[PDB]
Amino acid sequence: AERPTLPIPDLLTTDARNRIQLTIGAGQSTFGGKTATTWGYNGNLLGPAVKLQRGKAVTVDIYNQLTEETTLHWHGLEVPGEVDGGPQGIIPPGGKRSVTLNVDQPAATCWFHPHQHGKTGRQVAMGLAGLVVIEDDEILKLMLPKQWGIDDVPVIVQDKKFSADGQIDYQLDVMTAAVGWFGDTLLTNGAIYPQHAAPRGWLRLRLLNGCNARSLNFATSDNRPLYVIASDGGLLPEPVKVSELPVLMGERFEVLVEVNDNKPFDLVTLPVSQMGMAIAPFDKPHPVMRIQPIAISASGALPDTLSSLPALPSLEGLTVRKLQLSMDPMLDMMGMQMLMEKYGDQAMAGMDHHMNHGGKFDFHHANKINGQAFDMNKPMFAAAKGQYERWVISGVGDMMLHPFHIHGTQFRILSENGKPPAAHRAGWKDTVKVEGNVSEVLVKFNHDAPKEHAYMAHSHLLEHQDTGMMLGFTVG
Ligand SMILES: [Cu+2]
Ligand SMILES: [Cu+2]
Ligand SMILES: [Cu+2]
Ligand SMILES: [O]
Ligand SMILES: [O]
């Protein structure tokens, strides 16, 4: 059979009441011919791409048609805590919440997803995620590929696993609280190995790793390069040519890739050195999508310069905040041994060469920051507004992957896990790798967040977030 075409999320803009309507609901999807209950925004699975313009405000009306509580967070968008949609931003089942977003940051591909307390991993796994396309005046002058669904395409890559009856098989248990929820089936905008027909010339891909726990590493099947033009928070100063592009959970990059007549090629993900993630079929390069060239000229450009990146300031005299991540040693070893028992030595491929004892030992609060599992009632500190800070995040003490995300900002990485950041990671980021080492980022918060609607900072390995590896903080 031919491959299905890559599904393209609808690009949604406001009505004359300046409103965008998002309905959160359950429906059905099909994967490998078997139906599964799934959740979506304005549909059965995934969600639309909300289009925003710098300097314009939009109101979003969010209708929760699930039978459980949820929240809606705009990952990458810098907004006041009251509309950030962290775990305090509850939307009752059958209820509606509206937020007004006053967009105040450069053009970027951001995304949105649930942030329900202790249940974010399940709600993402069931299907909820959407996109945000921010434009500003600067980016349109560059004449990048811009025809949505033709030469400018979002690529949301996610794994799932399913039970024998076809349903999504999600469990937050000791093994996944240790290693994360991951599966054996790769989805690309919800579809298994789709094709996308693209015109000859440049193709812009807005890549999102939407997996709960799996890191990815994109490349092409015939080793043509990817030209990185943007990271989480917007354009780089100039394109950065790469042969492979590691992407952590929740990160975005936009790349341009050449499309040549008569030569289809795949976007692939290459095996990663992360526990559990190189079990078949991920022990080998895995196709994500086939690009099918069409013999019609594509109009977009890859300009020499994209934007101005300001200089890092002096670090002297900046507040230094220490964030020590930790996992419970006994429960990390138990979960890792369950993984090994299940899959054997392949569960560590690529890596460097039973009774109830009560609430004290419960894995639901095993993961922590500064010795505390997330306490929604007690923000850990009060950050400065409009002031740079140096946040130092340590994963010393364990070797698991912690893509560390901070709400309310786009930051600059000073050190990523003990090395200066790669050039394509040296611009605006909202995620930094922490794995067995220490990262340092330079952050500034331009908006307030009170205790009742605090900003979060957490690992975006969702099963770790949901079992305590998150803190709240206020601004202003
Ligand atoms: Cu996120
Ligand atoms: Cu976020
Ligand atoms: Cu978050
Ligand atoms: O987030
Ligand atoms: O998040």
What does this structure look like?
It is classed as metal binding protein. The entry lists the keywords Multicopper Oxidase, metal binding protein. The assembly is monomeric. Multicopper Oxidase CueO mutant C500SE506Q (data5). With 476 residues, the chain is mainly β. It folds into 3 domains: 1-146, Cupredoxins -  blue copper proteins (Immunoglobulin-like), CATH 2.60.40; 147-298, Cupredoxins -  blue copper proteins (Immunoglobulin-like); 317-476, Immunoglobulin-like. The protein has 5 helices and 29 strands. It has helices at 120-125, 137-141, 174-179, 329-343, 462-465; strands at residues 11-12, 19-31, 34-41, 49-53, 57-64, 73-75, 96-102, 108-113, 130-135, 152-160, 185-188, 195-209, 216-220, 226-231, 234-242, 245-247, 252-259, 265-269, 286-297, 319-326, 368-369, 381-383, 389-394, 402-406, 412-415, 431-434, 438-443, 455-459, 470-475. One copper (II) ion binds at residues 73, 75, 115, 405, 407, 456, 458. Residues 73, 75, 405, 407 line the site of one oxygen atom.
